[PDB]
Structure 1
Amino acid sequence: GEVPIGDPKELNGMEIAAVYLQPIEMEPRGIDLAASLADIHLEADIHALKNNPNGFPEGFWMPYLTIAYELKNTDTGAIKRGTLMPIVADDGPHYGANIAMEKDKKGGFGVGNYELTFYISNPEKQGFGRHVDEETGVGKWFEPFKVDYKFKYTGTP
């Protein structure tokens, strides 16, 4: 059962939603933390809005973007930063990562009201290009921006 975090934000021609489920077994194995040692699979859902500035058709998934997350507990004041890898499930491509909450050895990441950030950079760092000719070129990529959600952690769904 997937649980929404806050509600989506529409900026830079993209709909940015936050969701998390139970830890998810992943392949290739070894890159992302093992589902056995995690408490959640935090997924970032980012799709091009209608009339996207950068030529991405409406509803398409936005690939090659660099997503760094920050996980703050308002009650705990404990925060850790990590990365969200590009992943695909049976419902479509997305960005995700398994994170250990209750199992965070240093604690403070179990129970709590939470603040979730997404630090989003454009695909150019990953070698992704774009046309800039007058006939088929598209606009500039957004500059790095941040997105913040508020959610209260319920344990594993």
Structure 2
Amino acid sequence: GGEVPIGDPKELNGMEIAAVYLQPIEMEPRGIDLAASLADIHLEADIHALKNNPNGFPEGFWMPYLTIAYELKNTDTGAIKRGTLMPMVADDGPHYGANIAMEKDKKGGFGVGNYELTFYISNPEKQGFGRHVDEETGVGKWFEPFKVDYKFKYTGTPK
């Protein structure tokens, strides 16, 4: 298979925020996510620090401990589903991802067609990640929760 890019990457809040999908991915530990066999894609959010990141992250670093909720909407059929992307690592580094049933999902019309994808992104403090705030070593305040929107054509499992 391979990666299919979703929309255009956004630069916001000190971060580059890109979306891609792949074929379904076998994940460990088991039960952590939807089984590959029961899915049609693996959806990934690629989020890294820009230059001059205001929260202390070096350019290029992965942004860890983010809470990323998603909404995937087939605008042709109206079908909507939601979930969360979980942190994980592949051979090219860490990302946030989830296996998702598309055609396999008979509870809605999640077939090939036109989609809107939304990420709802909350800062690392929501998961207990800390920041220095002293004059000598501190960094700027975190972003408030925000959303990014992409549009793409889902053409089926990459093969």
Distance in 1, matches of 2:12 and 2:108, equals 34
Q: Distance in 1 between matches of 2:112 and 2:20?
A: 17
Aligned-residue CA RMSD (Å): 0.5
CA apart distance, 1:8: 0.4
Residue 125 of structure 1, CA deviation = 1.4
Which SS does the other structure have where 1:36 is aligned?
A: helix
Match of residue 66 from structure 1 = 67
Alpha-carbon distance in structure 2 between the residues aligned to 1:133 and 1:43: 35
Name the counterpart of 2:111: 110
Counterpart CA distance in 1 for 2:51 and 2:93 is 19
**Pairwise CA distance, 1:140:** 0.3
- Structure 1 residue runs without a partner (length 5+): none
Alignment length (residue pairs): 157
Q: How does 1:1-157 map to 2 (within 5 A)?
A: 1-157=2-158
Distance in 2 of aligned mates of 1:51 and 1:156:
37
Cα displacement (A) at 1:94: 0.3
Segment of structure 1 superposing worse, 104-113 or 92-101: 104-113
- Tell me by how many angstroms 1:112 deviates: 1.6
What's the % identity of the aligned pairs?
99
How much has 1:66 moved relative to structure 2?
Answer: 0.1
Bigger drift between 105-114 and 136-145 goes to 105-114
Q: Which moved more, 1:89-98 or 1:100-109?
A: 100-109
| Displacement of 1:107 | 2.9
Cα deviation for residue 135 of structure 1 reads: 0.5
1:7 shift after superposition? 1.1
Shift of 1:139: 0.3
Distance 1:132 1:58 in 2: 20
Alignment partners' CA distance in 1, 2:18 and 2:102? 21
Q: Give the alignment's TM-score, normalised by structure 2.
A: 0.98
Distance 1:123 1:105 in 2: 35
Q: After superposition, give the CA deviation of every residue in 1:12-66 in whole Å (9 maximum; x if it has no partner).
A: 0000000000000000000100000000000000000001000000000000000
State the Cα deviation string for residues 75-111 of structure 1 (Å, max 9, x = none): 0111011000001000010000000000112130012
1:32 & 1:145 partners in 2: Cα distance? 25
Q: TM-score, normalised by structure 1?
A: 0.99
Unaligned runs of 5+ in 2: none
